[model samples]
Target chain A: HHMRSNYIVIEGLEGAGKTTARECVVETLKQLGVSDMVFTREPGGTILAEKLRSLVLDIQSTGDEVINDKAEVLMFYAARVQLVETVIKPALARGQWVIGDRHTMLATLRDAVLGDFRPHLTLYLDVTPEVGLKRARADFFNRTRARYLELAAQDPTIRTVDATQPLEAVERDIRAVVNRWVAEQ
Target chain B: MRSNYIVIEGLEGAGKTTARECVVETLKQLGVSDMVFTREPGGTILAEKLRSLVLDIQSTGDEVINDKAEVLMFYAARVQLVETVIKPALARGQWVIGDRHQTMLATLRDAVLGDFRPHLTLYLDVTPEVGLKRARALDFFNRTRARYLELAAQDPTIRTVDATQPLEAVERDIRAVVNRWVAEQ
Candidate 1:
């Protein structure tokens, strides 16, 4: 098939530097003469979808009305459909390198694993729940402390990264794998 | 007898407004004197405020958001709409036509926010591109068309319409189905 633009998706636990890695890649791409690149995340990138995102993530789940896992996955796709059609597709059609911060893979991890919706991925982040929890703690102490453990108990996408190591080294290891995919594009 | 409070539900670009206009005009021409029209998440005083809180730019930026909060906010607005607008009109024996209602809340929230389901609904289905085109023509409220359609598709009460067909034919089909619903009321 004819290629339009290279699509690079980063998958990792919340605090595993996925967002930071995306930024690093974008910067690296810029140095490599690829200026037409965009980075984005879900429940966001559009006014409407963003609105929905705020509501879902911010609203604490209470008793009986606790947010259903399957429903959550469906909603993620709903926002994603808009993101893909409106922002992602158009950017790709313009030959812009599109780096998704989480993408659909995150939903698979979140719903299937944590939410008990499913459990699998083509490429796992391969981090342990403990290391993942630690990384998440570094970024968000309170929010991820207990929540990460709670979610980790549900599934195994919470891949580990050596937090004891330097940030540059950690990002370098991630980029090495990510760059292979981007380089071919 | 209470009149059926019908909602023409879909995403922003899904020709909801066009469908609303068509329904209104058809009723007017047919000399149907009992119908009233309104919208939820902004149909009433408190609900409009909630709608603004949920819609206007500032609230959408926060990261601590989730689906349950979003669903509640929508339902909060909807409850107001139902009590203040929909229920009253129906009680008055007026065949009410809602531009958007629970059907919309269910679909859009489910599609974008996460997986919220409405007790009853009626969806006006359209593909993303076609829906986008329809919203674009309207200038205002054109942005969220895709998000709305994503939500609308999830509802059983929200029937899909052949939007690609001519307007007259589309309206005829809608009325035929709606007429039966009216008799039920």
Candidate 2:
């Protein structure tokens, strides 16, 4: 009863405590006898992907060059695809559990630009727009949180966790959900 | 009557540089001189960065860009170029002549990933051995040329020019084909 999916994704807006949640997921998986694991983050987890992450996140305009919205979305997809193909997929094929901080929901929000990779299970840290924005110290948090909520509502594989609670409580809830999922599998 | 969005495609050392110059010259003669010429993976700022990530073979020590990742990067870069540079220029009534258009994607997809297909694709055809030799002379390594020709053979919008022919003949054929395309447009 301790079986688990090869790929598990922790998805949320900024300041949804994804890092801590990812740790929780990893620890729970380890307890479930899933020892071999590869942890990754969106727009990163590879050399090229890291560079792309910087390109996407860095707000400072270098030499008056602006990153357009569509371009930005494509870059994110590029990085995601790189991580999924070069790192995640191979790890999964080798029977190692691959945990990701974020997946393709953000990029696919622009349209039906589908990629070949999909998370076996996604733990969505649901946070209120106001709380997320305040914690992240950015106004963009609202938009991202809204999108995650919208996607979570549609995606059955995505399980929502109320992230506004205390860190320990959120971790416990996530652990319980993961434990149940593993047991069911 | 000479408004067109033309794409010149070829393997490295297949004389694409010279052919592009010829395309410019021919388009000028056809009285459609308002040209916005751009190359693949390096036209816009963001696109150039993506290109650099793809071409820079130095071991970045983090992760290797697998084939799927590389394909995704190319598509991302292509999308960025088309949206940010090509589409806007075309909207402004400028004749955009791309050095390598979506034909590259079609070939790459066949080899390894497309949203956009160009109006006219002039494929400079050469045998792999000949093309690789020429590419090496120019200090370029082209592994995709043979596959490009293979795919080009089946595509209707893609017209093949005999790149093994003399430079003058190649240019003349290119001009003749392009002129006919322009007239048809």
Candidate 3:
């Protein structure tokens, strides 16, 4: 068997240890002699993507316009497609491993807009409400976390890590997951 | 047969706003009141941000926005408006009228969100040249006009209004169409 460049995504809520896990992936890739890695933050990292990123994040910086849930999904899809078309696909073609910090949570829209484009593997950091957001915001985070778990369970490509563990143990779990996934590839 | 979600669609300068006002006039005279209005790609807060990105900035640094990305942005804003605004208004018995631009992937529209559509679309017909003259892009507008005419032909739900008529003639036509469409309900 031969090796091919593959796409990987790190999925998590805020404070779910994605940064540490990302570094672990990089370190593991280096050990395996797979060093041509491209890293990008979610909903961004290319020129158009960055613009969209700014637009979504600064939503309330000026006027009073709220985003719709469905619309947000579509907007992210636009950014994602731009990043994929202009950056990710090209990098992967040149035999580079692509690792993204976060991915959109909903798979149905993802499947529709992208059409067979998916990360070869998604490593989901699963954490409890206290561990995740640490209030109403907390309650919202819990609901989101439940949704992530629900989606992950239905899809085999997504693997979960118990992020409620200590930071070291969390990284250890990630390292193992990344290491194994890499080997399988 | 209808939910009062009426849309006026056409090329730039094709008299959509005129036709829209005519519809409103007809509805108000027919004992309909309490209406909420929206325009595509810019209705809600998030959608408006997307609209700016799509229509204004148009590009990031050295590259232009991709076609797929632009369509996604449009739909994202659309869904946001649909979920957070349009559907609720209709449920609350408010008449929702929208100004929409073409831009299909309508199948994507139906499948992604599951069969949501305007109950009626009044497509103001214009030769791209006449419309742009009354308004603007040569080739792009030409192709867009053709596409609109083509799609309108295929969809029974879309009714065409000839915008090339004299001002009074166009409004008279819309008045009759809106009245009949309303009567059908």
* Residue pairs with backbone atoms closer than 3 Å in model 3 (clashes): A65-B45, A71-B76
Model 1 residue-pair collision total: 29
Q: Sorted by lDDT, highest first, which candidate order results?
A: 3, 2, 1
Model 2 lDDT per residue over A128-181, tens place: 867765875656667777777888899877889999998889988998989888
In candidate 1, what are the lDDT values of residues A1-185, reduced to their tens digit?
Answer: 33346666665555556666667667666656677867767546665566555555444342222344444544455456556656666787788867776654454324422244221211123345666677656735445445545554564443333433567876675556445544554
Write model 3 residue lDDT over A119-175, tens digit each, in one string.
999999887777755612556777888888987889888999997788788777877
Q: Put down candidate 2 lDDT per residue, B1-185, tens digits, no spaces.
A: 43457788887667887898887887889888687889874787766666665556444554566665565566666666776777777887888888866343454333211345678888898766787778787233344665677677888788889898888899899888888877776
Model 1 chain B is weakest, by summed lDDT over 10 consecutive residues, at: B111-120
lDDT of 1 by residue, B43-119 (tens): 65545444565546455564322354455455445544555566667778786777766344444333333432332
Point out where model 2 deviates above 4 Å.
A1-5, A23-39, A54-60, A85-98, A104-117, A133-156, A166-172, B1-3, B11-13, B54-63, B102-115, B127-160
Q: What TM-score would chain B of candidate 1 score versus the native chain B? A: 0.63
Candidate 3 error regions (>4 Å): A1-3, A13-16, A47-50, A61-63, A126-156, A159-179, B1-3, B44-48, B54-60, B83-94, B101-104, B111-113, B127-157
- Given candidate 2, what's the lDDT at residue A93? 77
Model 1: DockQ vs. true structure = 0.04
True contacts kept of 3: 0.77
Error in Å for residue A168 of model 2: 5.3
Fnat for each predicted structure, in order? 0.00, 0.41, 0.77
Estimate the TM-score for candidate 1: 0.40
